[model samples]
Target: GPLGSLDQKTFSICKERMRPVKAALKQLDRPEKGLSEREQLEHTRQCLIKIGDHITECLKEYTNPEQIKQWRKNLWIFVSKFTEFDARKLHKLYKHAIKKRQESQQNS
Candidate 1:
């Protein structure tokens, strides 16, 4: 439904931008023998950081409605994946990461 907003071409570009996150997600699913759950949660935090930075980079390149709309769709998918991950912790972490990165850019 929401994904229907983006054209195939734009979606592909968006998908490529998010490719690292999707790959990290795959890695998270594999068993790591000694790692604790907290470690896994930390890894998810890093993955969310990747997702956020990728999105911010894309927004720089595409300011139009159609391009931004595709990002919204891609955001939906990434956020939903987060829900399936650690909903509370990563939510705050991702929010903070985005704000920090934005402010860092402003200061630079």
Candidate 2:
């Protein structure tokens, strides 16, 4: 019933991976000069892809079926909303990643 071993190394690596994506999301909120609206949208789309890829990769290391199922469901929800360029959904995913990192850090 436990969530299984989601080792410190994996969390550490994933947290690092989230760093740039997090920054990218923030940039979308207050984009720098010279970035057109279309360019901004494209950047967000790419960041969303990165988020999905990171989650998919991390899911492989987890063994709990229930946990995996729940995360997958949540991932789908996030991806769907994020694809629409919803700022709220973007922040939700970012917060979720930060929370996961903090939880692993606390366990260590």
Candidate 3:
């Protein structure tokens, strides 16, 4: 599958990135540690922005696939978690979140 392309048919795959972070936030002994669903969604949106920025930054700095390979290597350190996650469930949630974000922005 194409990078992030699982977004079309299944978003659960991509959205799995937030699970660990959300879970961690919920184990809140601190006043600010717990997150509402909206807050969690915001965090995920911020992460997607960071993801897009990272890819854009890599493409802008690397002219060829060889140099881009280094970016891929670094990215793998993060997304490799997906290899252990269920692809279908992950992509479905990812696409749903992405679509909701888009619609929310449009309505605002």
Candidate 4:
């Protein structure tokens, strides 16, 4: 499912999946007047990439190969949106940390 359709249960699960990355992000220094914006941006980018990598590892635990590939693509899409250090937006991308494909199939 797309991020707009993310549910509470999965959202919490996603949050749990990258708890350490989130904590690290929180520890970063905020950009203040006269601070180096470039350095802050670079640091944020690295953090975002780490978040994506962590999600990839978590997905490998239960997600199938085909689905994991798709999730990786979706992850980069979300990562590109983190151009600004917005915690709210970061939480929104956490919706991409889902563990399994949402599709339902029946075996006969």
Predicted structure with the largest lDDT when compared to the true one: 1
Query: Runs in model 2 with CA error above 4 Å?
Result: 1-17, 25-34, 73-108
- Model 2: per-residue lDDT, tens digit, 1-108? 666434566445545545646654345445556889987656655564466556665566568998677655454443343245453566476566555545223211
Ranking under TM-score, best-scoring first?
Answer: 1, 4, 2, 3
Ten-residue region with minimum lDDT total, candidate 3? 23-32
Clashes (N, CA, C under 3 Å) per candidate = 0, 0, 16, 0
lDDT of each: 0.59, 0.54, 0.44, 0.51
TM-score of each: 0.53, 0.42, 0.38, 0.46
> Measured by TM-score, how close is model 4 to the native structure?
0.46
- Candidate achieving the largest TM-score: 1
At residue 93, candidate 2 shows an lDDT of 64
Q: How does candidate 3 score on lDDT? A: 0.44
Q: Name the candidate, 3 or 4, with the larger lDDT value.
A: 4
